[PDB]
Amino acid sequence: AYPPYNLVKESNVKWRIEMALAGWSPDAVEVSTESNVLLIKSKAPHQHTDPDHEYIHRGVSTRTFARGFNLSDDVEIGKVSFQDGLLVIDLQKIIPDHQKLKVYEI
Amino acid sequence: AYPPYNLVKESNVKWRIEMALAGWSPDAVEVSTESNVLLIKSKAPHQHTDPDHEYIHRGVSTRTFARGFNLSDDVEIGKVSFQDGLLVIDLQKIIPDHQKLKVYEI
Amino acid sequence: YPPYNLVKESNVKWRIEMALAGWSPDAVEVSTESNVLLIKSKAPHQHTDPDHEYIHRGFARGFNLSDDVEIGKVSFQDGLLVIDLQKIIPDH
Amino acid sequence: AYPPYNLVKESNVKWRIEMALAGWSPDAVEVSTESNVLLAPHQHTDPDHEYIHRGVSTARGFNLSDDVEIGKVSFQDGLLVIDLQKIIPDHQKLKVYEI
Amino acid sequence: AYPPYNLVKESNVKWRIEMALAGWSPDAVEVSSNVLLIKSKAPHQHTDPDHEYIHRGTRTFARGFNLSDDVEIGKVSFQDGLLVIDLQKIIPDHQKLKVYEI
Amino acid sequence: YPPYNLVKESNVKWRIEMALAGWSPDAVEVSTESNVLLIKSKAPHQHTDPDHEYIHRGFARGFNLSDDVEIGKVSFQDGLLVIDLQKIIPDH
Amino acid sequence: PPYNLVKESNVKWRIEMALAGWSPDAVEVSTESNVLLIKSKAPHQHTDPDHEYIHRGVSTRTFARGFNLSDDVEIGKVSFQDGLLVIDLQKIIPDHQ
Amino acid sequence: AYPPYNLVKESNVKWRIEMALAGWSPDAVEVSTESNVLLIKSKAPHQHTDPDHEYIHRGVSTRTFNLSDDVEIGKVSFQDGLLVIDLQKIIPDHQKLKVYEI
Amino acid sequence: AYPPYNLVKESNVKWRIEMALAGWSPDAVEVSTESNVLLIKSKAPHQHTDPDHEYIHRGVSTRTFNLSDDVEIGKVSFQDGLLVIDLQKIIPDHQKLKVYEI
Amino acid sequence: PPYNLVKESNVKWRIEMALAGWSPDAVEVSTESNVLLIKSKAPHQHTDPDHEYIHRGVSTRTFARGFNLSDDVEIGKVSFQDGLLVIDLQKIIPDHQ
Amino acid sequence: AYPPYNLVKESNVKWRIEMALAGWSPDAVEVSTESNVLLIKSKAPHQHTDPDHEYIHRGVSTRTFARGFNLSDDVEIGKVSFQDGLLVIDLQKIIPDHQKLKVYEI
Amino acid sequence: YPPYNLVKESNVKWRIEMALAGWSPDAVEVSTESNVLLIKSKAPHQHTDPDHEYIHRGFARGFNLSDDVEIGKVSFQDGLLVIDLQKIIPDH
Amino acid sequence: AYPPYNLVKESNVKWRIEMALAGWSPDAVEVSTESNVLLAPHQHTDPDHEYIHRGVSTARGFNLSDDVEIGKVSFQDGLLVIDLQKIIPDHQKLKVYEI
Amino acid sequence: AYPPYNLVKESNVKWRIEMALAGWSPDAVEVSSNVLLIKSKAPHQHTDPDHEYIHRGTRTFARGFNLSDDVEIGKVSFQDGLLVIDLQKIIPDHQKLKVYEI
Amino acid sequence: AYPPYNLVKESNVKWRIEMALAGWSPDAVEVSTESNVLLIKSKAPHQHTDPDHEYIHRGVSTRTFARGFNLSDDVEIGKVSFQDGLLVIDLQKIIPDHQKLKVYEI
Amino acid sequence: YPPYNLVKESNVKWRIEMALAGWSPDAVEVSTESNVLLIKSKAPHQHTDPDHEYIHRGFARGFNLSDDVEIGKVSFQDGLLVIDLQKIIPDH
Amino acid sequence: AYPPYNLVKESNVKWRIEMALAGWSPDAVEVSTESNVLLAPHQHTDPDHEYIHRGVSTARGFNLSDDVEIGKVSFQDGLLVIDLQKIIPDHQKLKVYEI
Amino acid sequence: AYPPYNLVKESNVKWRIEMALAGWSPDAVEVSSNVLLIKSKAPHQHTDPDHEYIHRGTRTFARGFNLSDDVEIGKVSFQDGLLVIDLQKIIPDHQKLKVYEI
Amino acid sequence: AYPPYNLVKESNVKWRIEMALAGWSPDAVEVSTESNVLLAPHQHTDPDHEYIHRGVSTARGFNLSDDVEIGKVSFQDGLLVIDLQKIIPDHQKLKVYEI
Amino acid sequence: AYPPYNLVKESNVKWRIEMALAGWSPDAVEVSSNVLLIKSKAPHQHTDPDHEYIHRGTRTFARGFNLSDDVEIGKVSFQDGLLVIDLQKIIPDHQKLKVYEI
């Protein structure tokens, strides 16, 4: 029921999002960033009807959806690459300055 | 059982609250703001009794209620408009300065 | 259905109080049909808020009159309908 | 298996009965008004070979509200559409007052 | 509720269909690879309400039946809200009603 | 299995639209066998992301053709397969 | 009713049948469109006084029995004897035997 | 389930029996009268040894399956797999069917 | 459960009874004929008093357990724990096994 | 079939057995690898006309009965009388009695 | 099973805690404040035994318990009043400087 | 009901210990009736905190005495009632 | 208890039947092609003492797709491997066009 | 699905085993403290797909049976996909088929 | 199913972690600190197979696991002591400057 | 019970590997009894951490030996017990 | 169906029995004190026509605590109110000591 | 627990009601569109406790019965805690107790 | 209802049977060693009046591990305490090596 | 598991108790308002382990029985792990074993 999303966890600073949008034109698609909370909003602005001129079973269903995720501040965007009905968005932020992993006592 | 409330989500900065208070006088009603946590408190200060002089079925029930919601800081108020037993409260705050939604790579 | 309260002031008087919130004066048209009152509430606007922004949220009525009704007052105040009806004289 | 009946008020003076009767001719059907209540002359030996299975097969009362009368009955496209007319309640008055 | 329907079985060459369509005009209704389709499609009819008209005991319907080849149509008669369609085809050279000995 | 939509343009034409996301041109090889179309999707890479970093996440098809098919157009655009087939002439 | 089946050969199907009491005018057989229909229709009935008649086990009824044949099945002989129907059919020539 | 037999009750004295034995030769069948008790024995002398592959269905098949004094037998007519046995006996010297009053 | 007895049915007149009494001495067993009703009584005179520890299983054990006129007895042969009782009586003057027609 | 058991002493096990009708050629006993097998195999059968025979209670059947003995059990006597088998075994010498 | 605690909500700045400790000496009782997270720890340091010299049913049971609550910073203490086996602790903090509750438009 | 503990010091002595938290000296009045002790706890204030602010939160007793009782000490300390009773001499 | 059968298409012109028949010799087994459908001569009185329990014990049809033919049958290691060959559908053409 | 297997019981000295291994080559198969192990271990065989070959009705198996000491092997015969292993050992000095009196 | 971990709660400033890693070489083990969120990642880099030369039942199972815990900032490390297949990690941070536990009124 | 793994190096050798975490050298004492090995693990300290601070958290074994055992090596390394046993020569 | 009884202690010397007896006259009712335990003279043939359904229809013991006595019995408004008086336990003493 | 009540059915003109009100004073009780209402309303009575008085086996009640028009009241009698109300009205000109032939 | 038995190994050479036998004298009880397995002489007519209900009422085998022997049997306080002694397994050797 | 116990009922004056205490020394055991208490309280005994000694089929117990007044004790005998306590009191002046007429 959830459209088929995937989240790819690169480094300490970088998290990529992988997206299955097949048939979606770029005029339909709209992303939004409100207070470091990402809203991706697919909206069919042409609103293709469900006519029965001679149309059969439609298993794949698509019109208008909305999603939200509170990100840890202060997320920026790196790249977005539209390639064969998939979106690979690259978000790149986090500066803790404490990634040390070496201590021993025997 | 919850009195019939509605929350209306305007912009990135603005969130409106819609309120069904029918029969409530303004002396009864009391709102409260403690540490950016909104408490709306309807209190019947006249305390209308349930007499049986000749009174029948009372499906609509009303005396004293209390509600709470932790808002993200630093919420202020814009307008409140009492019009035919409804309250439309306009809250207007949020300054992220990162609402950019355009990046591509092919 | 909206939520209805009923009261007798006396045997003369029935008083109905009604929570209709958001309803406007053109949206409500009442009718009297066959010794039966019909309070109809019809939205004269296709209530469509912009789906993009707002989505997520949480009629006709008939009642027989017991000859012979005399309608008093009907007040549209603070989202309430307060109707005052009158009927007795049973001669007995 | 009774036919399917649909009843409606046009207004205060307009009942309307619409009725699906398929295959019914003009001498089989008979209506009667009895006590303020509205209410196959030759049948056939069906041949088994030709009549393997019919998927269709071919009295109904409704006590009237004082005091119903008739307007127009009309056979069209296998339906039955009966107009009935009655009112006088001496009460069709709408009243409202106050801000 | 799909409507209800009778099938008469005259000969081996002829199969007649009896369809129950009451209130249907003859521009709504449309008949059409050795497969028959009887489609009823409201072109110009009334939309219902909940105020004046309410309770009932009629929209658009389509039907399919894969017949053996190569069926033609004969005569369609619209009377008493009934469609009586005649279909006439088949010569299998095998309709032999026989065989008896002692 | 991927999710399949089916449409008749006319009786002539069947049009199939297909969501294959991430699939590449070498990964898809189609075949025609015994008046039956087989659309096979085989990963030509052992899809192994570095387990260390990425783990947690959320075929062949056969359909009989009704003599005699004429394949039109097949477009690999924006993660969709849009195939246009043709078959009628029943002489009747 | 109770039926039994035999393949003499690839050529031959034989159907054996128990019809007890059935008269020769009642029985009919049709070979319509490569589909056999063995009909058994009593023409009329017998005067049955429910007074002294008891627990009637034999439900006397008409029946039509259809079977879609493998193109294209033919009849050979039918012999009515000992209250049995022995029907001989004949078809093959599949060039695969 | 057993074979479907019918008993006709002609008179007080006479009882007729209708047996359904289809495809039974007359040397398999035998009837016995012992101690004023009848026994109708269907006894296959040898079962027709046949293959179970060519004969797809063998649901219905053929295998092997006290009166008031002083019973005699009238007739037994075997034709077209139906047995009709006529029995005629009973004398109580009391078969008067009369008496009526007000 | 009771002892496993078998009744052989020789003729209408003659009936034979086969009783299974293993390990039963002949003074325990007794047979009685009373009012044209037989009674075969197995009666242990004293039970062999034995210990229940050394004898692990005592599942199967030994304890204590209307004809048509005018029955007589023919023979009763006791050997290797099997009783074979020959009874021979029945005369209805009606044992004819004949009658056949077309 | 119905079996009974006895320990006369530490030396002695005795098995008492009801075999009714069994003939002397049918019965066999084997002492194989410190495991006793008392066999009861009817050599052939009897002509059984199902006509007048009724409710056969005695299911006549062949049976082989094995029991793993405590090393190392021996036979003493077997006496066939009154349709009983009385088998005497003898072993002890455990230096613990 | 929870010992019988009560929380009393005075003002926007003040929240009182009411406590049922009957028989508890003050040497036993120990409170703790770690990063504005209150830990009250009752510990029977005498560890009264359960002897059976002639002792009957003991429905009231008491030895060692521990509790925790993350408070909003930077909680301080006001008073604590030991009076008849009850503790009334007064915590007093919160400075939002936004408690305004009056806006209208008609 | 409040929670009650029971102890014998000896056969002479019963000692009852009682958790009554918030209870005051006027709120508790004890009675002796028919060789039966009745410890009654009655609120002499209608305990009504201001609903506006505070709402959400989480009797009589009779026991027969086994002739002849001698009441010792009863201490109201730190929300406890510690009563010391005395009864033996069975002459045997 | 029938034996276990496995059917496979090598290609468009290659069916392949593989068959487990253990203990089966070369005169017991008989195959037949009947109506476009592919389909123990002396048994033994097993001695009870030696044959306490066997844990193995020793007709099957499949209507063919017009119009199957035979290639090579081979007994090896107690299996049966039958090659069958047939095609001509007049249709083995792959077609695709567009960006 | 473990494969299926017969055990023949010649004498008290000899016990023959019959194993069902069809399609197994004689380098895969391997036989080996008075406990027999018949291991079948695929050394060089085909791996399956889901495209050309699909449905079936054969991997690696191992078996253990604690025999009384001190078993040796006699002859193993690989024919018709059957292994017939002969094992020949045992002299218990107790195979006495006797004892009868009156 | 969770490998057998234990958490030891020293002071207000110090929390120790106790770890059951038996058979794990130090080349396999890898810890990670991303934005004060500890990820301990055991990865068998030799990838010991499950051969059947003569190997029996293996109840103890070990290959690759990963764990995560969001710590309150700004966690540092104190000691780590590898001693008989156990790891005792000492984390030491928290400066509230409000640990006072003494107030009375009678 | 602690979790036990079992391996044959050959028929000669059994090798047992054992997760005993926190266990010390005085806490483990092994015994051989009646051709049966008993690995006993007894805490020589009453493991009592200060309840005040730490509370919340998440034996003997016998196995018969198959004459005649020869114990090889037993290594207490990194919280593992790796025992190497030896037994074959069946003369057959 | 017994009547409904309510028992009460006024004090240590005051039991009080209150009793609903509707339609009961002054010669039907009889009370008795037996063994330290407190415990329709002419009935009618009701006529079916007039007496379609009555929705009402018209011995009880309680062992007394040594040693109960009587005070005042009073018929008023169809009830029965019996005052009983007894005490002397030689023990009505309240005692308490300590801070 | 609603109280319990008897209805006596004198004539077709007269219907008498018998109400069970024990302990009720005559200022509490009140009787009143061709619909009778018998209301019992505590005006001056005692409120209960849980200390002195406890267990029981009496508050305020109201009753409605739509009678055919145009009922009047006759006499109400308060005795033995029973209310006996007399109502007397009805002339339907149809109380004919007849009709018999042969 | 058998008595209650408790078995224990003191060491490798020390079994110990402890046994509750209440009311049992010294001539009723008999023990026997049979085939490497360890295993009321005059009863009374109890009088019903005096013996209303007794709340107590008054052979057991255990195959021994080659080859058990006896030490000391002792009646004390209604119990039975049997010491048994046996070992020689030719194997009581503990061995361990490595860091 | 509470231990098990017999009660003997000599006369109306005398009731003897038989207690089952095996392994109990006479300093552990202690007997004591016309209510008898037989308390068994381990003073000096062994604590169990799980290594040497394990399975069983004995701690501290107390018992109470409200006897009619004013019971005294007679004799307590500790033999075969049984306590046989004698209690002797009661004169009700009513033990009359009589009353018969015709």
Residue numbers in the entry:
A (entry chain A), B (entry chain A), K (entry chain A), O (entry chain A): 44 to 149
C (entry chain B), F (entry chain B), L (entry chain B), P (entry chain B): 45 to 102, 108 to 141
D (entry chain D), M (entry chain D), Q (entry chain D), S (entry chain D): 44 to 82, 87 to 105, 109 to 149
E (entry chain C), N (entry chain C), R (entry chain C), T (entry chain C): 44 to 75, 78 to 102, 105 to 149
G (entry chain F), J (entry chain F): 46 to 142
H (entry chain E), I (entry chain E): 44 to 108, 113 to 149
Per the authors:
Of all the constructs, only SM2-ΔN14 crystallized and the crystals diffracted only to 7 Å resolution. The Matthews coefficient suggested 6 subunits in the asymmetric unit (ASU) of the I4 cell. In spite of the low resolution data, the self-rotation function exhibited clear peaks and showed the presence of threefold non-crystallographic symmetry and additional twofold and fourfold non-crystallographic symmetries. These peaks indicated that SM2-ΔN14 has 432 symmetry. Despite the data being limited to a resolution of 7 Å, the electron density map calculated after the MR solution showed clear and well-defined density for individual subunits and for the β-sheets within the subunits. The ACD has an immunoglobulin-like fold, with two β-sheets comprising eight β-strands (β2–β9) connected by turns and loops. The electron density is absent for the first 43 residues in all the chains, indicating disorder in this region. SM2 has a long C-terminus with 31 residues, out of which only 14 residues had visible density in 5 chains and only 7 residues were visible in the 6th chain. However, the positioning of the dimers indicates that the C-terminal regions are poised to form hydrophobic interactions with the β4–β8 cleft of the neighbouring dimers. Judging by the proximity of the clefts to the neighbouring C-termini, it is clear that a network of dimer–dimer interactions similar to those in the reported 24-mers of non-metazoan sHSPs, is formed; holding the entire 24-mer together. In the case of SM2-ΔN14, the interior surface is hydrophobic and the exterior surface comprises both positively- and negatively-charged amino acids as observed in other cage-like structures of small sHSPs.
